[PDB]
Amino acid sequence: QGPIWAKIPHTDGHFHPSPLMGGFGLKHPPPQILIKNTPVPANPSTTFSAAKFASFITQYS
Amino acid sequence: GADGVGNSSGNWHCDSTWMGDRVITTSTRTWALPTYNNHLYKQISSQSGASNDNHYFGYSTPWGYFDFNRFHCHFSPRDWQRLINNNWGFRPKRLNFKLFNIQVKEVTQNDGTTTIANNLTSTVQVFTDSEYQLPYVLGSAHQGCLPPFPADVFMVPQYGYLTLNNGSQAVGRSSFYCLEYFPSQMLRTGNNFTFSYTFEDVPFHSSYAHSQSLDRLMNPLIDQYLYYLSKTNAPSGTTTMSRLQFSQAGASDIRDQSRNWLPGPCYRQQRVSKTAADNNNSDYSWTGATKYHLNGRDSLVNPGPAMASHKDDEEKYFPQSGVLIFGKQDSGKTNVDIEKVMITDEEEIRTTNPVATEQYGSVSTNLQSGNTQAATTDVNTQGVLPGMVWQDRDVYLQGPIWAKIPHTDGHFHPSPLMGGFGLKHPPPQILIKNTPVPANPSTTFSAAKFASFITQYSTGQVSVEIEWELQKENSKRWNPEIQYTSNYNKSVNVDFTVDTNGVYSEPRPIGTRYLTRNL
Amino acid sequence: LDRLMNPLIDQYLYYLSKTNAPSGTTTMSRLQFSQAGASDIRDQSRNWLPGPCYRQQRVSK
């Protein structure tokens, strides 16, 4: 139940770069995977307004 | 190349070319070379009454040498700005050197009046120590490099070296080198000298600052799944009892999170303030200094391992002997005030390297028990540990470029402590000398060596071209970055220009770390 | 030439609309700025200027 890898910090020098919590030190570790729900605006006004939207449809995925 | 008296043996090349990931800088200067030591080799040694720390033994030769081991020999201030504002790293690739338009001139000192004339048949000797057989004296931050301003004429420095000594005397192991024992090329006016050199592979110099701290690398929104010891006792009826308790670290207790890395090594220095009143009223320049002990001698550690100059909100402080200190224009040699020097600052590396004037940390010294409380102590010197990361010292427009790595059995992270690139085969030394021309000899034979020569010196042009490899930045940062810039406000003089008397001056030291990078 | 805007949307640029403001029973110099719309269309920022001129005398039929 412990960690597997850790990204080696991009520095000028480092010594024996195995992460201290245990595991494999990688200069190019598995990349981060980001995910987000695209916002869906709610019912807008019928007269133009330059203010940014603040009312969205509540949803998840 | 070789031709007559009325033919220039070379042209003036001085500019920079930027093309993609390369930049080629070529510079030209005019030099003057006297006759050193009156054509003799001389044994030199420390004074008899010198302290044991200052004893030395060595030789001084009649040779001069060319030196271009400072960045401002190659980069103009504008070129330096281009480099540091748009690149994450750089390194030298190859080198070209040329010596041309030699002129030898003889001096006559009749009756206090000096007459100078051409000597068309005299010569100069040049050779490059391409096998590293002479003691390498470059890389010690000596004066005598090419001037930063291309219009200046400079004198070639004299060559000399030190060997093993026992006090003021030598030992059997000490070695003596005769530079005439090398093959060298002899040039008359009309000959030139060139050679080429290829740098070995070295890591790019880090021209960035980290935008994250080593102790701040977590996601501040999610707790860890690991626990730490958060309390060692708990309240009982009107009292307490020993009782271990554990917690998961979050943002509220961010100092307790488990981490994978450690800050770089440390070697503590004494702190002094730029405000005069803050410092002690005593002479602690040597007693309070940090030094190393080698063969019974003490030697100042200067500047030593790369550590941050100060923590935040403390620009007024700096380590006693932990920073490079350049002098302002025309500042003296000995005991000048603080207004005459320019003190560098290495604060950009406090994200990974400890502050030079604080302890590295604290470790426990005993075993706590029912009747013994835990005790800790500060760590003032910490060698490297597995899991450490650190940055190297920055380079400056007027600082050194490279240094020769000593030929030893072992070495660790061989980047020179004054900053720059460590090379096992650095650019070779270039020695030069006027060939002696004896004066009127006697008409009856004498076996004694000659002692009367024609007084003469030489002059000419020197050019050096270096190709540098660039490493372009690829940042996804949204907000604008910090850049080096000139101030817009009015002033009597423009920075990095000449004054009304013709004196070129550099008003401040310029590092390389302006762009940013994630840790 | 002076009517080329969209009369429904205000500009994002400002113009100087008032140079003084009322104080206690008096006024004080105080610069104020506004975004031009349709109500003050004469104040909108524009990209062009009318052609040159050389004034003549006017006569009536």
Which residues 339-398 on chain B approach chain A with CB closer than 8 angstroms? Answer: 352, 384-392
In three-state secondary structure terms, B265 is coil
Residue B334 sits at the vertex; the CA angle it makes with B328 and B337, to the nearest 5 degrees, is 55
Which residues 168-197 on chain B approach chain A with CB closer than 8 angstroms? Answer: none
Elucidated via? cryo-EM
Nearest to B515 by CA among B348, B347, B313, B310: B348
For B213, nearest residue in chain A (alpha carbons) = A9
Whole-angstrom CA distances from B226 to B232, B250, B253, B387, B388 are 18, 10, 13, 19, 22
In three-state secondary structure terms, B37 is helix
Q: What is the CA radius of gyration of chain A?
A: 22
Q: Tell me if A14 and B388 make a contact (CB, 8 A cut-off).
A: yes
Q: What is the DSSP string of B171-236?
A: -TT-----GGGS--EEE-BTB-EEEEEEPPP-PPEE-EEESSBTTB-S-TTS--SSEEEEEEEEEE
Task: At C24, list the tokens.
Answer: 């206690």
Measured between its terminal Cα atoms, the distance across chain A in Å is 28
Q: Using CA atoms, how far apart are residues B399 and B349, in angstroms rounded to an integer?
A: 18
Quote the longest CA-to-CA distance of chain A: 64
Q: Using CA atoms, how far apart are residues B133 and B129, in angstroms rounded to an integer?
A: 7
Chain A / chain C CB contacts < 8 angstroms? 4
Residue carrying structure tokens 């004037």 = B357
Q: Using CA atoms, how far apart are residues B41 and B148, in angstroms rounded to an integer?
A: 31
DSSP state letter for B313: T
For residue A46, the chain C residues in CB contact (below 8 A) are none
Whole-angstrom CA distances from B273 to A38, B176, B279, B316 are 55, 45, 6, 5
Residue carrying structure tokens 């817009």 = B488
- B216 and chain A: CB distance < 8 Å anywhere? no
For residue C8, the chain A residues in CB contact (below 8 A) are 48
Q: Using CA atoms, how far apart are residues B139 and A4, in angstroms rounded to an integer?
A: 44
Task: At B371, list the tokens.
Answer: 């009747």
Minimum distance, in Å, between the CA of residue B353 and any CA atom of chain A? 11
Q: Which phi and psi (to 5°) does residue B39 adopt?
A: 75, 20
C21-46 as b/e: b if 16+ CB within 10 A: eeeeeeeeeeeeeeebeeeeeebbee
Q: Tell me if A12 and B415 make a contact (CB, 8 A cut-off).
A: yes
- Strands of B205-360 (E only): list them: 205-206, 208-210, 227-236, 239-248, 266-267, 271-273, 291-294, 297-300, 317-319, 325-327, 341-343
Q: Tell me if B392 and A17 make a contact (CB, 8 A cut-off).
A: no
- A34 and chain B: CB distance < 8 Å anywhere? no
Q: Using CA atoms, how far apart are residues B274 and C14, in angstroms rounded to an integer?
A: 48
For residue A48, the chain C residues in CB contact (below 8 A) are 8-9
- C9 and chain A: CB distance < 8 Å anywhere? yes
- C53 and chain A: CB distance < 8 Å anywhere? no
For residue A50, the chain C residues in CB contact (below 8 A) are 10, 12
